Design a protein around this ligand. Structure first.
Ligand code: SAH
Length: 327
């Protein structure tokens, strides 16, 4: 569905706006060296320039969303990124030979530093065909992104892969299709390798059956791993209209659905979807802001923009969660 696929333009605008202002990279929390901090920005900057080459319409959407970002959104984007990153880094530091499967990867570039930083990491990006065709175009067209992946400019990979360049694979898959998904995994992952699964604003676009099948099945495919999921929740307090508001706004604006926003309207209900994993941690992004963000970062963020409305931040961030499931 082309509607769902374009929710990536929102995710990308947000990523890009946070880098522009200077929220990211956070070299401390993302564990970026001097050169990788520089590259982080340079890679995202080229990604936007190269997107422009491939799609005027895409670029215009991304561009206007960036210009109109507000501090509360940049804090959210920062929290989302460092929170996932912190979960990933802890596991990769502890587990040398690891595979990362990034489900609904959109324009995510976290592989670029991760692959450098962790010599024995293998990483697999998975999104709809149309989305991964565009990502493959940008990655190969841009000289700096090609170099970062050791890629050639001529797409030289065999279906099911658009990129199959050593420790990185970019592959198309409809994740509503469990058989296509498990088939795809059989040829790019191994059962016995500690596996991190990332679903960052992916499951929110899925019907409960499809998302629960995908959760169960993927967890069953690997002896051990960690699922890191980030998503909104509709919110459980009485008279909390966040979910209601969000669903209505997406249906009127984009014809877009978030089928289980109200079903998983709190962190505990959300986390319960990984009840097969022995170790489930769940926090809303406000809790992350208070628990994981050092005072040095809080001070560095204040230097960049005026967050005049901290309570507005808190309200939004209590409606996003980071779930960590380990088996
Ligand atoms: N059924 C499905 N199969 C594969 N990709 C899907 C999918 N449903 C949604 N997606 C992908 O999920 C992404 C959500 S936008 C999130 C992008 C990225 N994970 C980030 O946080 O920046 C879009 O790229 C969309 O195409």
């Amino acid at each position: 569905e082309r509607i769902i696929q374009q929710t990536d333009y929102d995710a990308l605008s947000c990523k890009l706006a946070a880098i522009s202002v200077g929220y990211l990279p956070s070299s401390g929390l993302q564990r970026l060296s001097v050169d990788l901090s520089k590259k982080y920005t340079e890679w995202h900057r080229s990604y936007l320039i190269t997107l422009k080459k491939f799609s005027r319409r895409a670029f215009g959407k991304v561009d206007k969303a960036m210009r109109s970002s507000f501090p509360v959104m940049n804090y959210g984007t920062y929290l989302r990124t460092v929170g996932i990153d912190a979960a990933i880094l802890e596991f990769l530091v502890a587990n040398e030979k690891v595979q990362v499967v990034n489900l609904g990867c959109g324009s995510d570039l976290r592989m670029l530093p991760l692959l450098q930083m962790f010599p024995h990491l293998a990483y697999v990006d998975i999104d709809y065909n149309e989305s991964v065709e565009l990502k493959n175009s940008i990655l190969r067209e841009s000289e700096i992104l090609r170099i970062s992946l050791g890629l050639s400019k001529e797409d030289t990979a065999k279906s099911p892969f658009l990129i199959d360049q050593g420790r990185y694979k970019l592959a198309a898959c409809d994740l509503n299709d469990i058989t296509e998904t498990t088939r795809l995994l059989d040829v790019c992952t191994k059962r016995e390798i500690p596996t991190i699964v990332i679903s960052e604003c992916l499951l929110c676009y899925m019907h409960n059956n499809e998302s629960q099948l995908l959760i169960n099945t993927i967890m069953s495919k690997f002896s051990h791993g960690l699922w890191i999921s980030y998503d909104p929740i509709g919110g459980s307090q009485p008279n909390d209209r966040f979910g209601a508001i969000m669903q209505s706004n997406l249906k009127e604006s984009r014809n877009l659905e978030m089928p289980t926003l109200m079903t998983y309207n709190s962190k505990e209900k959300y986390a319960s979807r990984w009840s097969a994993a022995p170790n489930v941690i769940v926090n809303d992004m406000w809790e992350i802001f208070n628990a994981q963000i050092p005072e040095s970062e809080r001070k560095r963020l204040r230097s960049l923009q005026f967050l005049d409305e901290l309570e507005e931040l808190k309200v939004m961030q209590t409606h996003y969660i980071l779930m960590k499931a380990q088996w």
